[PDB]
Amino acid sequence: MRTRSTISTPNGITWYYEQEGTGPDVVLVPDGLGECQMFDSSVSQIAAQGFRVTTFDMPGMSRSAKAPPETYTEVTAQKLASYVISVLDALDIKHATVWGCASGASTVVALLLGYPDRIRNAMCHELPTKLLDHLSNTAVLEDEEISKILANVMLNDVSGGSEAWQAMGDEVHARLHKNYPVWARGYPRTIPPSAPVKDLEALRGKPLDWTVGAATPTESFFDNIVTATKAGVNIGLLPGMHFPYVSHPDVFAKYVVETTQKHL
Amino acid sequence: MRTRSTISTPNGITWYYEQEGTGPDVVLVPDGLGECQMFDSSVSQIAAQGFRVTTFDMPGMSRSAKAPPETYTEVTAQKLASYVISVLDALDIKHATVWGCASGASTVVALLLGYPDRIRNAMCHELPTKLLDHLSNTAVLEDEEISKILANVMLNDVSGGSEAWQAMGDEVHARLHKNYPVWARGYPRTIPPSAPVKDLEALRGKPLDWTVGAATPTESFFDNIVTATKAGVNIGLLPGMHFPYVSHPDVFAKYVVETTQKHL
Ligand SMILES: C[C@H]1CCC[C@H](O)CCC/C=C/c2cc(O)cc(O)c2C(=O)O1
Ligand SMILES: C[C@H]1CCC[C@H](O)CCC/C=C/c2cc(O)cc(O)c2C(=O)O1
């Protein structure tokens, strides 16, 4: 039985969250678009090994839109990590395995470095380190135009699995539509300079497992592979591209349970 | 004026070779398909910055087909390296910068390690280190069936630049047609286990500059990035995928001259 509910933290945010299972805590942090329906299948799968899976829409996005604008403007890994630690406190999750991709990747590594006693271990996927003008220049377009462009970027380039993407259904895509603009204005300019990955030595030794999409063009996260390898951090691949939990749930959920298990 | 000619070495091979310019020697080693017409524009471009550019069809391929079958069966970075040293001796090129992609990549690093006094510096691009069953399974499969399949792999997947690929013209494609089978039977099984990169400490400090295609799926040479990074070897990207000298001559030639100049 999945809990589907809301909970409020004292930084102004009213979070939509979901939760399934009994066991050590695994937390699935969404990517930029902040939409936790993307995890729905994997939540059940991971929970059926013995875990309590929690996930949530991110502040300003989908059903967690009731939040103050500092929460979704000029966003940074550090800020997102603050927010995630606040919803974790509210749900009395003391010790969590965490996953996160893209801005979620940034967020979990910043969790891992900033709050070592709270994070059993962290899985980051395709952590953004470089600015990226095609994305960034959409911020100053009108809402709606942005939605047309970003919707299309997600669909054709970057799911790694376009059928699966579309199959999320009309509701989810209606929520994403409203999300694109807030993301375009809040994330692409400011997330990458915040990357907590410039201090190689702080990564060394940490319980961190880093991945990239197998199908993703080598240029997109070449830097993740260089950085991880210099820092001794475990790195490898998942199938697809930027959303392994949409395109390849079964392998995604396997990878999460299997990696969590290593750090118990 | 380009020299277009042949020369014979005492290991049975009659090489077709080309050469343009005066200066330090830069040698362009073809990829598996062994066909040096692919360099034609770059040969001129590199030569005009003051170098003597040599290139050649590889043994058993295109216009260097008069060669004994041990030169194109059960091929191997070490073998290919001896062959290229032999055509270098015949042409009295005493010191060369070398470039190579794919099996050429394997060949140039074996040159660099085996013959340090002959190699000013080496540029390797997408070095094969894994077996690869879709390729390998073509070996047992009719000369002309293999040419259909491999011609189509090259066209659609892996030029990185399909218009440029086709524009090489019918002549070169007729030569390639005959080449695909020889390659399929001689290269994919045996080149990768010969990869001279399993000794990281031999790479360290050497004048080696390694690249991968920006557009190439991350999985294809993820390992090249790990290895280079562990060995302190210079690594980065060129545009396109597996043939940057077909798809992006101007930036290829720029990369070759600029890199040669660093070691010059
Ligand atoms: C939403 C997700 C979309 C990935 C597909 C993107 O369209 C493909 C480009 C990858 C960019 C990811 C990204 C960059 C950035 O600076 C900040 C971000 O929050 C993200 C990110 O979360 O990208
Ligand atoms: C011919 C060239 C282009 C084919 C790229 C292929 O379409 C992409 C596969 C990349 C590796 C190719 C390759 C593997 C190998 O074991 C030996 C080789 O000589 C090659 C190689 O030369 O690939």
Side-chain angles (χ1 to χ4, degrees):
Chain A
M1 199 78 69
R2 199 161 306 161
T3 296
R4 302 194 167 81
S5 183
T6 55
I7 187 165
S8 282
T9 48
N11 50 24
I13 299 159
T14 296
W15 298 84
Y16 174 80
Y17 84 98
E18 300 192 350
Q19 209 190 62
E20 183 162 335
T22 335
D25 278 305
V26 170
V27 178
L28 305 185
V29 188
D31 62 73
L33 313 179
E35 161 62 72
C36 74
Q37 182 56 34
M38 303 189 9
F39 288 126
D40 160 50
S41 142
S42 300
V43 163
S44 278
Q45 253 181 286
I46 297 153
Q49 303 304 302
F51 303 87
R52 193 171 65 188
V53 187
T54 305
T55 193
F56 30 79
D57 295 346
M58 297 286 274
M61 308 297 185
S62 299
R63 289 138 312 173
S64 292
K66 190 178 162 149
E70 60 270 6
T71 276
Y72 53 86
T73 70
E74 307 218 275
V75 179
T76 63
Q78 294 67 42
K79 275 163 81 174
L80 288 186
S82 228
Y83 305 148
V84 176
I85 271 302
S86 79
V87 72
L88 258 33
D89 283 349
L91 298 154
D92 203 18
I93 294 163
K94 307 177 136 124
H95 201 219
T97 293
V98 288
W99 153 282
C101 164
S103 54
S106 298
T107 296
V108 300
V109 170
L111 269 348
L112 178 65
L113 274 25
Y115 305 75
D117 51 320
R118 304 297 288 292
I119 311 308
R120 181 150 57 238
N121 75 122
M123 294 166 276
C124 57
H125 184 82
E126 303 194 339
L127 193 155
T129 257
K130 316 198 137 146
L131 306 130
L132 215 37
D133 275 332
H134 69 112
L135 269 18
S136 259
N137 288 321
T138 66
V140 73
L141 252 25
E142 316 282 13
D143 291 355
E144 205 67 48
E145 173 96 350
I146 297 166
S147 303
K148 214 253 180 180
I149 299 154
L150 267 12
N152 209 300
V153 163
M154 299 317 145
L155 172 49
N156 268 308
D157 305 353
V158 292
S159 21
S162 151
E163 326 250 337
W165 184 256
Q166 264 161 280
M168 292 186 309
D170 302 336
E171 261 164 6
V172 174
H173 284 301
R175 294 206 294 270
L176 286 185
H177 189 265
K178 303 179 81 183
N179 289 349
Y180 293 121
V182 344
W183 175 85
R185 281 197 298 271
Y187 281 62
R189 286 172 285 145
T190 24
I191 248 66
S194 74
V197 117
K198 307 165 209 291
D199 183 0
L200 271 30
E201 290 314 314
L203 267 13
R204 202 180 295 288
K206 304 303 194 236
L208 185 54
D209 281 268
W210 201 319
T211 50
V212 179
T216 293
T218 290
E219 79 180 322
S220 300
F221 304 93
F222 171 99
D223 72 276
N224 287 184
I225 301 159
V226 175
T227 299
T229 289
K230 290 185 167 156
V233 180
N234 270 358
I235 175 132
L237 308 183
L238 270 3
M241 293 195 37
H242 308 278
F243 296 105
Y245 38 88
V246 182
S247 58
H248 298 89
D250 226 305
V251 181
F252 173 74
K254 260 198 195 42
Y255 167 70
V256 176
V257 358
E258 180 180 74
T259 306
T260 299
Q261 256 149 47
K262 279 201 274 123
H263 293 95
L264 309 156
Chain B
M1 200 211 158
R2 199 161 308 167
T3 293
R4 302 194 168 77
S5 183
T6 54
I7 187 163
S8 283
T9 49
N11 52 22
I13 301 159
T14 295
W15 300 80
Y16 171 82
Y17 84 96
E18 299 192 352
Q19 210 191 61
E20 183 161 333
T22 336
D25 277 301
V26 170
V27 178
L28 303 186
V29 186
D31 56 273
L33 311 181
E35 161 62 73
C36 73
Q37 180 56 29
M38 302 190 8
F39 288 126
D40 159 54
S41 153
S42 299
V43 158
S44 281
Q45 253 180 283
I46 294 153
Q49 301 309 303
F51 302 87
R52 191 172 56 183
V53 184
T54 305
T55 192
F56 32 81
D57 295 350
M58 297 285 274
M61 311 295 186
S62 297
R63 292 138 307 167
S64 292
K66 188 180 159 149
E70 64 268 7
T71 57
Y72 55 88
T73 69
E74 306 213 284
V75 182
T76 278
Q78 296 68 41
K79 276 161 82 175
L80 287 184
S82 78
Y83 303 152
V84 354
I85 227 81
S86 78
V87 74
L88 259 33
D89 290 337
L91 297 157
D92 208 20
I93 291 164
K94 305 181 135 125
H95 313 274
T97 293
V98 290
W99 152 283
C101 165
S103 51
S106 300
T107 301
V108 302
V109 14
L111 283 168
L112 177 66
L113 276 23
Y115 305 84
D117 48 324
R118 305 297 287 290
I119 310 310
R120 179 151 58 240
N121 74 124
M123 292 168 274
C124 57
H125 184 78
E126 304 194 339
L127 192 155
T129 55
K130 317 195 138 144
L131 302 264
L132 212 39
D133 277 327
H134 72 110
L135 289 184
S136 253
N137 296 152
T138 66
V140 289
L141 207 70
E142 304 284 42
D143 285 0
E144 208 72 23
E145 282 165 358
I146 298 164
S147 302
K148 208 91 180 179
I149 298 155
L150 287 182
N152 214 297
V153 165
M154 302 327 306
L155 175 49
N156 268 308
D157 306 351
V158 79
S159 21
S162 151
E163 330 238 1
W165 185 260
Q166 264 160 280
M168 292 187 307
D170 293 333
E171 262 219 350
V172 359
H173 286 301
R175 293 202 295 267
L176 262 14
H177 188 269
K178 303 208 77 180
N179 288 351
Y180 290 121
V182 169
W183 177 79
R185 277 197 299 271
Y187 281 57
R189 264 114 44 145
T190 22
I191 245 66
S194 78
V197 293
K198 55 201 208 291
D199 183 359
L200 270 30
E201 289 316 311
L203 267 12
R204 202 178 295 287
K206 304 302 194 237
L208 185 53
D209 283 88
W210 200 320
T211 50
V212 179
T216 293
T218 292
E219 77 183 316
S220 300
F221 304 91
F222 175 99
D223 73 275
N224 285 188
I225 299 160
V226 175
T227 300
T229 292
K230 287 185 170 156
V233 180
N234 253 257
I235 177 133
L237 309 181
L238 292 176
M241 294 195 36
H242 213 84
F243 296 100
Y245 37 87
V246 184
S247 59
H248 297 80
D250 184 70
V251 15
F252 176 72
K254 274 157 212 204
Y255 166 71
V256 177
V257 357
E258 180 180 74
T259 306
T260 297
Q261 260 150 191
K262 279 200 274 124
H263 289 90
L264 182 46

